[PDB]
Design a protein around this ligand. Sequence first.
Ligand SMILES: Nc1nc2c(ncn2[C@@H]2O[C@H](COP(=O)(O)OP(=O)(O)O)[C@@H](O)[C@H]2O)c(=O)[nH]1
Ligand SMILES: [Mg+2]
Length: 169
Amino acid sequence: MTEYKLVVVGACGVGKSALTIQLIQNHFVDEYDPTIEDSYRKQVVIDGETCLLDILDTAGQEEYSAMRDQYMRTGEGFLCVFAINNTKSFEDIHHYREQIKRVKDSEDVPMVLVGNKCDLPSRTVDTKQAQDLARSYGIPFIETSAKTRQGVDDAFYTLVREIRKHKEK
Ligand SMILES: Nc1nc2c(ncn2[C@@H]2O[C@H](COP(=O)(O)OP(=O)(O)O)[C@@H](O)[C@H]2O)c(=O)[nH]1
Ligand SMILES: [Mg+2]
């Protein structure tokens, strides 16, 4: 069965683990160790194709930098997550975009921009600002809430569809 290797990146505290756990286990966790990096496997059906998602929930620094390069080189698509109430997390997207492109040595890497925590009233990054960034990158942008589940399937399924478009060239 086809497997898609997905990697979730972004600043600490944006909701990478909460998003992953909602996708895999269908519930919201308010408390999940910010230092835990692990992979989850989930069989799903996307556009009629039964496939396996192999998702790496990243946690930032690695014991050795070679471990970061290894997962960036082997990952097929990347969910770049910021939180709509954390401007620093949005500014950090530039760093994640540039770093993945450098490790893969490619200008065409399947990526989706995710603005998480859209259930919160507090917002410091308006939608337009993120739409403009995603346009400059040529990638989709999805607002999500790991708490309410809004957009969660869409974010991950859209990344799979971006990977498919890349593979068919
Ligand atoms: N209200 C709200 N809180 C969230 C959401 N996603 C994550 N959180 C909270 O933000 C904190 C950090 O989330 P976490 O998944 O650990 O982020 P990570 O460091 O990127 O893995 C946790 O306390 C979660 O309760 C969301 O969509 N809405
Ligand atoms: Mg985490």
